[PDB]
Design a protein around this motif. Structure first.
Motif, PDB file in Angstrom:
ATOM      1  N   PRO A  33      -8.854  -1.267   9.933  1.00 47.80           N
ATOM      2  CA  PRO A  33      -8.622   0.125  10.269  1.00 47.80           C
ATOM      3  C   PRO A  33      -8.383   0.049  11.644  1.00 47.80           C
ATOM      4  O   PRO A  33      -8.810  -0.707  12.626  1.00 47.80           O
ATOM      5  N   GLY A  34      -7.250   1.079  12.219  1.00 47.67           N
ATOM      6  CA  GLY A  34      -6.841   1.004  13.570  1.00 47.67           C
ATOM      7  C   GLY A  34      -5.312   0.250  13.622  1.00 47.67           C
ATOM      8  O   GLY A  34      -4.919   0.532  14.792  1.00 47.67           O
ATOM      9  N   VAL A  35      -5.128  -0.933  12.745  1.00 53.01           N
ATOM     10  CA  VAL A  35      -3.908  -1.530  13.349  1.00 53.01           C
ATOM     11  C   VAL A  35      -2.805  -0.670  12.822  1.00 53.01           C
ATOM     12  O   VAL A  35      -2.768  -0.014  11.790  1.00 53.01           O
ATOM     13  N   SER A  36      -1.660  -0.870  13.284  1.00 52.87           N
ATOM     14  CA  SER A  36      -0.375  -0.005  12.967  1.00 52.87           C
ATOM     15  C   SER A  36       0.193  -1.120  11.976  1.00 52.87           C
ATOM     16  O   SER A  36       0.086  -2.450  12.234  1.00 52.87           O
ATOM     17  N   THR A  37       1.369  -0.524  11.330  1.00 52.28           N
ATOM     18  CA  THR A  37       2.237  -1.332  10.346  1.00 52.28           C
ATOM     19  C   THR A  37       3.030  -2.088  11.478  1.00 52.28           C
ATOM     20  O   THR A  37       3.751  -3.326  11.142  1.00 52.28           O
ATOM     21  N   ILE A  70       6.151  -2.730   4.607  1.00 48.62           N
ATOM     22  CA  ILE A  70       4.889  -2.511   4.342  1.00 48.62           C
ATOM     23  C   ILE A  70       4.671  -1.188   3.862  1.00 48.62           C
ATOM     24  O   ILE A  70       5.156  -0.174   4.210  1.00 48.62           O
ATOM     25  N   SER A  71       4.031  -1.430   2.722  1.00 49.93           N
ATOM     26  CA  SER A  71       3.885  -0.055   1.898  1.00 49.93           C
ATOM     27  C   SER A  71       2.496   0.672   1.721  1.00 49.93           C
ATOM     28  O   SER A  71       1.609  -0.178   0.939  1.00 49.93           O
ATOM     29  N   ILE A  72       2.100   1.538   2.284  1.00 54.00           N
ATOM     30  CA  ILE A  72       0.701   2.239   2.094  1.00 54.00           C
ATOM     31  C   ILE A  72       0.714   3.093   1.105  1.00 54.00           C
ATOM     32  O   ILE A  72       1.529   4.037   1.242  1.00 54.00           O
ATOM     33  N   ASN A  73      -0.468   3.037   0.209  1.00 50.45           N
ATOM     34  CA  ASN A  73      -0.923   4.093  -0.600  1.00 50.45           C
ATOM     35  C   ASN A  73       0.384   4.551  -1.513  1.00 50.45           C
ATOM     36  O   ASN A  73       0.707   3.598  -2.367  1.00 50.45           O
ATOM     37  N   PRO A  81       8.123  -0.778   8.738  1.00 50.27           N
ATOM     38  CA  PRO A  81       6.839  -0.962   9.511  1.00 50.27           C
ATOM     39  C   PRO A  81       7.044   0.131  10.824  1.00 50.27           C
ATOM     40  O   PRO A  81       8.136   0.317  11.151  1.00 50.27           O
ATOM     41  N   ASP A  82       6.054   0.590  11.314  1.00 53.84           N
ATOM     42  CA  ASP A  82       6.174   1.457  12.544  1.00 53.84           C
ATOM     43  C   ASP A  82       5.047   1.501  13.244  1.00 53.84           C
ATOM     44  O   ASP A  82       3.694   1.389  12.763  1.00 53.84           O
ATOM     45  N   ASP A  83       4.968   1.453  14.486  1.00 54.52           N
ATOM     46  CA  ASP A  83       3.806   1.423  15.576  1.00 54.52           C
ATOM     47  C   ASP A  83       2.828   2.864  15.655  1.00 54.52           C
ATOM     48  O   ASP A  83       1.718   2.784  16.009  1.00 54.52           O
ATOM     49  N   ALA A  84       3.673   3.972  14.897  1.00 56.76           N
ATOM     50  CA  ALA A  84       2.799   5.148  14.863  1.00 56.76           C
ATOM     51  C   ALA A  84       2.190   5.075  13.412  1.00 56.76           C
ATOM     52  O   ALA A  84       1.439   6.288  13.374  1.00 56.76           O
ATOM     53  N   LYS A  85       2.370   4.339  12.438  1.00 52.71           N
ATOM     54  CA  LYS A  85       1.669   4.032  11.151  1.00 52.71           C
ATOM     55  C   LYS A  85       0.241   3.574  11.325  1.00 52.71           C
ATOM     56  O   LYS A  85       0.450   2.052  11.333  1.00 52.71           O
ATOM     57  N   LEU A  86      -1.043   3.983  11.355  1.00 58.74           N
ATOM     58  CA  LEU A  86      -2.056   3.561  11.548  1.00 58.74           C
ATOM     59  C   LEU A  86      -2.806   3.091  10.393  1.00 58.74           C
ATOM     60  O   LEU A  86      -2.888   4.284   9.485  1.00 58.74           O
ATOM     61  N   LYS A  88      -6.131   2.923   7.765  1.00 55.13           N
ATOM     62  CA  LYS A  88      -7.487   3.905   7.842  1.00 55.13           C
ATOM     63  C   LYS A  88      -8.222   3.376   6.657  1.00 55.13           C
ATOM     64  O   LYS A  88      -7.742   2.611   5.575  1.00 55.13           O
ATOM     65  N   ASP A  89      -9.573   3.410   6.621  1.00 51.30           N
ATOM     66  CA  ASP A  89     -10.491   2.756   5.436  1.00 51.30           C
ATOM     67  C   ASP A  89     -10.103   3.395   4.241  1.00 51.30           C
ATOM     68  O   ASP A  89      -9.633   4.681   4.149  1.00 51.30           O
ATOM     69  N   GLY A  90      -9.904   2.666   3.508  1.00 49.57           N
ATOM     70  CA  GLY A  90      -9.621   2.933   1.846  1.00 49.57           C
ATOM     71  C   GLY A  90      -8.077   2.693   1.667  1.00 49.57           C
ATOM     72  O   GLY A  90      -7.987   3.004   0.738  1.00 49.57           O
ATOM     73  N   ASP A  91      -7.341   2.543   2.619  1.00 45.95           N
ATOM     74  CA  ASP A  91      -5.929   2.442   2.353  1.00 45.95           C
ATOM     75  C   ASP A  91      -5.583   1.389   1.415  1.00 45.95           C
ATOM     76  O   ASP A  91      -6.321   0.184   1.608  1.00 45.95           O
ATOM     77  N   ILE A  92      -4.576   1.232   0.671  1.00 45.64           N
ATOM     78  CA  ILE A  92      -4.277   0.053  -0.111  1.00 45.64           C
ATOM     79  C   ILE A  92      -2.790  -0.317   0.662  1.00 45.64           C
ATOM     80  O   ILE A  92      -1.849   0.517   0.746  1.00 45.64           O
ATOM     81  N   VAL A  93      -2.553  -1.486   0.755  1.00 50.08           N
ATOM     82  CA  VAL A  93      -1.379  -1.767   1.331  1.00 50.08           C
ATOM     83  C   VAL A  93      -0.663  -2.979   0.731  1.00 50.08           C
ATOM     84  O   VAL A  93      -1.401  -3.892   0.612  1.00 50.08           O
ATOM     85  N   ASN A  94       0.637  -2.931   0.537  1.00 50.83           N
ATOM     86  CA  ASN A  94       1.352  -4.179   0.038  1.00 50.83           C
ATOM     87  C   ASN A  94       2.254  -4.618   1.032  1.00 50.83           C
ATOM     88  O   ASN A  94       2.784  -3.733   2.139  1.00 50.83           O
TER      89      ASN A  94
END
Ligand SMILES: [Co+2]
Ligand SMILES: [Co+2]
Ligand SMILES: [Co+2]
Ligand code: NA
Length: 262
Positions: A33-37, A70-73, A81-86, A88-94
């Protein structure tokens, strides 16, 4: 034109395949949690270029601006990928990686659960991986690809999820996306008999909700139409004399690398 690889070709694919798998192994500790893509993308790229001495196949392909996908949820595939996309707990990411080494490609992806998993997310990732493993166990010379797609779909739908139709696996080698199209569902349009030396990927995308998808106005990002969670796993394999060999196997895979039928 379905290319049949020579033994020398296969050797180079084994190298590219392990390189790709390693990027996935490597990145794990950073997924929190807290890292950006955007940061995950930079770490991957640095690793590929500086340590592996390879190159990302994605960078600049059709104009793609980054090194990995990087694909989230609800993002199905092609997340940028993007510096603004952080995270969070519970996210699933490919994280979908494709590396080039000595001119051959290695393509693979896996899901990562950030922090504390959700019930739905855990289950969805599990089912998706199992559907990939199922398909892998069927691969052998003589079988029609159609049977494989049909099997995946049946499995998935039996578990209450749906399979995305639009995107599929593909041949791979000197080219990133070669023939054939490996569909993850039953289609009367599919008629391809497998033979040794063929190399391709299986990378099923499964939705918790309905199968429908939509492309975003950024022209890359694909999301579910109903905003349900979507998951995917991918491996590159070579069809052998009596089964298959998984070229991008990782330490956490729980399927053997050589699958033999007799
Ligand atoms: Co070095
Ligand atoms: Co891929
Ligand atoms: Co692929
Ligand atoms: Na996703």
């Amino acid at each position: 034109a379905i290319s049949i690889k020579t033994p020398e070709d296969i050797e180079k694919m084994r190298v590219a395949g392990r390189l790709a798998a390693e990027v996935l192994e490597m990145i794990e500790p950073y997924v929190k949690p807290g890292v950006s893509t955007g940061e995950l993308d930079r770490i991957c790229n640095d690793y590929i270029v500086n340590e592996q001495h390879a190159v990302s196949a994605c960078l600049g392909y059709h104009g793609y601006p980054k090194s990995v996908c990087i694909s989230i949820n609800e993002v199905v595939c092609h997340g940028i990928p993007d510096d603004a996309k952080l995270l969070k707990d519970g996210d699933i990411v490919n994280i979908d990686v494709t590396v080039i080494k000595d001119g051959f490609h290695g393509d693979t992806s896996k899901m990562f659960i950030v922090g504390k998993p959700t019930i739905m997310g855990e289950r969805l990732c599990r089912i998706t991986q199992e559907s990939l493993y199922l398909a892998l166990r069927m691969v052998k010379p003589g079988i029609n690809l159609r049977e494989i797609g049909a099997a995946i779909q049946k499995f998935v739908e039996a578990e209450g999820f749906s399979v995305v139709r639009e995107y599929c696996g593909h041949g791979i080698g000197q080219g990133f996306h070669e023939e054939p199209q490996v569909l993850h569902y039953d289609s009367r349009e599919t008629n391809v008999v497998l033979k040794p030396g063929m190399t391709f990927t299986i990378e099923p995308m499964v939705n918790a909700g309905k199968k429908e998808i939509r492309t975003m106005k950024d022209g890359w990002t694909v999301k579910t139409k109903d905003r349900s969670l979507s998951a995917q796993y991918e491996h590159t394999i070579v069809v052998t004399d009596n089964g298959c060999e998984i070229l991008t196997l990782r330490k956490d895979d729980t399927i053997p690398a050589i699958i033999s039928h007799d």
